[PDB]
Design a binder for this molecule. Sequence first.
Ligand code: PLP
Ligand code: PLP
Lengths: 321, 325, 92
Amino acid sequence: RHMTRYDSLLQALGNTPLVGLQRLSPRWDDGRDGPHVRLWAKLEDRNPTGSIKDRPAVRMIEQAEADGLLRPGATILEPTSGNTGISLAMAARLKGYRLICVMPENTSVERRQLLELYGAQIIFSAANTAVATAKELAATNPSWVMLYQYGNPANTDSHYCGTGPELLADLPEITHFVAGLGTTGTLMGTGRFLREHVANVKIVAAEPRYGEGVYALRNMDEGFVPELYDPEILTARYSVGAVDAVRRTRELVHTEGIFAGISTGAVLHAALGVGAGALAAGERADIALVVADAGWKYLSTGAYAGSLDDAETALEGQLWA
Amino acid sequence: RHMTRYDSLLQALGNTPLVGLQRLSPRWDDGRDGPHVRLWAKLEDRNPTGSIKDRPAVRMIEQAEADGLLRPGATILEPTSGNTGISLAMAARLKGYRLICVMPENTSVERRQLLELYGAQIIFSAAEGGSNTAVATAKELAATNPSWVMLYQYGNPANTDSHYCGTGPELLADLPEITHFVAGLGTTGTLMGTGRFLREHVANVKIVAAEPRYGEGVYALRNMDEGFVPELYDPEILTARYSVGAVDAVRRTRELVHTEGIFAGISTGAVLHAALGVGAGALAAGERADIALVVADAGWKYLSTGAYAGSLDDAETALEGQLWA
Amino acid sequence: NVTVSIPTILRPHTGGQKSVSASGDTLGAVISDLEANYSGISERLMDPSSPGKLHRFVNIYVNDEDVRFSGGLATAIADGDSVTILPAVAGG
Ligand SMILES: *Cc1c(COP(=O)(O)O)cnc(C)c1O
Ligand SMILES: *Cc1c(COP(=O)(O)O)cnc(C)c1O
């Protein structure tokens, strides 16, 4: 936290850079035509394992330690094959836990191999079925700990206590926060913190209309995610197709040099919509947007095909978290 | 330094974290058996394009811009094994320069994906001779097309300057107790600039190179006179130089992620192997040591090589025909 | 006895063999022994203009350590050691 030397990787969690997008911003400089409309990218790929999930994964573990649920050498069980799986794998390793990950047998070999490199043991399930297999294994097995990231309060708390406070410290002038919509932890936690501290701040969701849609059904149901449907909590939600996401991630790498993951294309598409609105409205805007991971893990997935058509097919057939 | 908001990605360059390796260190705290022998990893993957090369690439471009060599629409030509070309491709895209990279063909696919994404042309040079062949090819092209700008990372003192003014100062500010610096050896910029800075500012510090050892084909020059030593290199800066083969480098790369959670490139495994040797030496001698080592890039650009999966033997067979730094 | 890795460029001196045995208690002794068995090889390792020194573009390592930092041809060699000879290639 303005620190540069750390006694372990876990201590380097968070405190990620916020970077201005002078070229992609609708109007970086205030001038005769009106106030600035600025985009600021919060680079969550700078975390230990290269995604925002290091925050909730560490917090979920630390909360389970505090609640006496995790004792030395325990086994953690997780029905995830993505960014949370990777983060929990790193974190479990550094703290002395075993991590077991359950995933469909038709999970890409590259996703499987990244998990294994960090130390996760894999159990394959039939190609919410992975969650069902994880649950039978919870039954048959002796005090394995499931943490469940979707309902988990420690997931939202990690953003309420981490991401939100860092954004306010770096960008006290923030007018809008834009992030992806998966477990909802990022938007719920960071949004609650910002709404408590910044009068009239606007919270905007970017939801990919591509990928598996792990939480997509969930997030359509007000019984599961009531806050998403309160206009005083969430101002707006963009549903973003693959073709727009692909165009935006190309635009970001070419205009600003930032090589973002596939969820960021939805986030940038929303943030550009919000910025176009503020510019047309003659309003000053300082719009913070999350880059939750970098492009690196998607290079083997077809996401960088030449054809935006082939890139579309690739984004539709893969997980974005 | 000590900043978290920046007005642009290039402005966020450097000021990378230095992270202790408590588990891998030969001895983290002073004990009854003798003083500590600590390893500290400088995470140069936390740079704009994900490698240490953002430092010399930005410095070289900015020096050339200051010199008046680069103006809008200029062509940059550079021989590279991937990282420098990626850093230059990003800076050239943002600054409106065309980039042509000459790169050996036996480099990882992720490098050419990123170069193509940033709109650089790639000229693939033959695998025999490695970077020597790419350098010879680039020098011929530069001579033929004098209007292009070849920054020439193997001879340009702005490469070393970037480390004498960046990497070295940051390391010393974080680790005034430093006893050793370990890094890779390619252009020699990292060790020549960081090592000159450290030797000038730190009594008794030692500078150690960890050089990859590639398969036989990489070294299959036709004449010994096709040998090449970068013009930046001064052997007087080094205390030792280790040659590390693929199995040892891959082993240590896997150990680093398994033990410390850091997912690094294969050159980092060669660095770590050297640093553990140096560490073992200090421990045997009962000497206190604080050994900083460079993590030049993350593992992402090496996933296609196979080295992070399967058995530790066969990662070796996977890398035999390939460059990995 | 030590095991010496011979780079492709020097294998015409060793009948094409990539790895050969040698004996000697210093690098210079191993080079002498190599010359006894593989005529012409030592001249390829040494600087034609600065006799007694290695060729500028040859690198030699004993158990992975560059002899330029351990005494050159006087570098000590023990039974079971590996000796690696490589031409100078930037990055390798
Ligand atoms: C988790 C994740 C998201 C979604 O964030 P939530 O907090 O789960 O809503 C978006 N993009 C990436 C890359 C993610 O890992
Ligand atoms: C460039 C590079 C090195 C070598 O650094 P130099 O300053 O050129 O000597 C080591 N590892 C990686 C991954 C590199 O890109």
